[PDB]
Paper text:
T-STAR is a tissue-specific STAR protein mainly expressed in the testis and brain3426, and regulates the alternative splicing of CD44, Tra2β, Tau, VGEF and Neurexin pre-mRNAs262728. STAR proteins are defined by the presence of a highly conserved RNA-binding domain, the STAR domain, also responsible for homodimerization, and composed of a central KH (K homology) domain flanked by two highly conserved regions, QUA1 and QUA2. Here, we have determined the X-ray structures of the T-STAR KH domain in its free state, and in complex with AAAUAA; KH-QUA2 in complex with AAUAAU; QUA1-KH in complex with UAAU; and the full STAR domain in complex with AUUAAA. Taken together, our data reveal a unique mode of RNA recognition and dimerization by the STAR proteins Sam68 and T-STAR that is crucial for their function in alternative splicing.
The structures of the T-STAR QUA1-KH and STAR domains in complex with RNA show that the QUA1 and the KH domains form compact dimers, with each KH domain binding one RNA molecule, while the QUA2 domain does not adopt a fixed orientation. The QUA1 domain adopts a helix-turn-helix motif involved in homodimerization, and its fold is very similar to the structure of isolated Sam68 QUA1 reported previously (backbone root mean square deviation (RMSD) of 0.61 Å). No electron density could be observed for the N-terminal half of the linker connecting the QUA1 to the KH domain (residues 35–42), suggesting that this region is disordered, while the C-terminal half of the linker (residues 43–53) is well defined in the structures. Strikingly, no electron density could be observed for the QUA2 region of T-STAR in all our data sets, suggesting that the QUA2 region does not adopt a well-defined orientation. Accordingly, the structure of T-STAR STAR in complex with AUUAAA overlay very well with the structure of T-STAR QUA1-KH in complex with UAAU with a backbone RMSD of 0.9 Å for the QUA1-KH atoms. Interestingly, the presence of the QUA2 region in the STAR domains increases the radius of gyration and maximal dimensions both in the absence and presence of RNA. This is consistent with the QUA2 domain being flexibly attached to the QUA1-KH domain dimer, and may explain that no electron density is observed for the QUA2 domain in the crystal structures of the T-STAR STAR and KH-QUA2 domains. The absence of electron density for the QUA2 domain in our X-ray data sets suggests that the QUA2 domain of T-STAR does not contribute to RNA binding. The crystal structures of T-STAR QUA1-KH and STAR domains show that the QUA1 dimer contacts only one KH domain. From our NMR and SAXS data in solution, we conclude that the contacts between the QUA1 dimer and one KH domain observed in our X-ray structures are most probably due to crystal packing.
Numbering used by the authors:
A (entry chain A): 5 to 32, 46 to 161
B (entry chain B): 2 to 35, 45 to 157
Amino acid sequence: YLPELMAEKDSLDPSFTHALRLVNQEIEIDVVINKNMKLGQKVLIPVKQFPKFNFVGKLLGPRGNSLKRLQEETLTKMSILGKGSMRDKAKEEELRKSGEAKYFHLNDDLHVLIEVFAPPAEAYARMGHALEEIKKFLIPDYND
Amino acid sequence: EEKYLPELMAEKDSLDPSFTHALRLVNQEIEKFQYIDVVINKNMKLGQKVLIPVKQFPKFNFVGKLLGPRGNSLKRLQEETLTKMSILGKGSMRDKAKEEELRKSGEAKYFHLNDDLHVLIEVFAPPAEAYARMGHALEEIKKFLIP
RNA sequence: AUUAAA
RNA sequence: AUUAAA
């Protein structure tokens, strides 16, 4: 069986990071019941268009309060991921070099991941409300 | 991702071929490469395939209750919810002998017949509007599936 | 338990 | 011009 993979995991050179991630990744709607669906949407952060604006700070605010309040008022969970999301950039490269699925996202572009867990008709409406409020953060020029 | 792929090809070339599963998995990860923007705020496409309960209600035909006379009640729902709803899956066609239609010819046009009988709600709008339209459509479509 | 739209 | 949440 595939447990051959376990023999590869221990014996593979740690210098191959993406292969060791893929091998460890390989370890393996009804509306009338109306149980809780989960959704997610990855929203790009326009650093190409606004390179002089720091979005990560405007989004989080003091001790993350502004992101917490948006999460609370939209009833969603938001996570800032991608290249440039971490505060320590030397740690961000070594964690990207670490190439663990948890930190794998750093290879991608700076973006927000909004998650919502609710019954389906509510879960879609909550995500739509969150997408309307988050653009005020991602659009400095929202006047006109 | 301009940084990710050159490291895969570097691993591909430098890796020991004796690792067959690991080398196969990085090749599968390479074949993949051969996400919303709200400041440009262009239209996305959302869809949700909503099964309708024939296992729970085998005696109730929903597809007729959904369409109505000449599809008036379904188009009225598509108008008020501003979505495109298409009934697909096994039993969607009224003629079930002409169903299992081709399907060994294998056209993705007809591939949906292998899926269970459902309703695919598609909505085309900007992301904030698209997600809010879908949520409203799922609100109203319950009323057809709860006799 | 006759609803058939795109 | 600062903000650093999970």
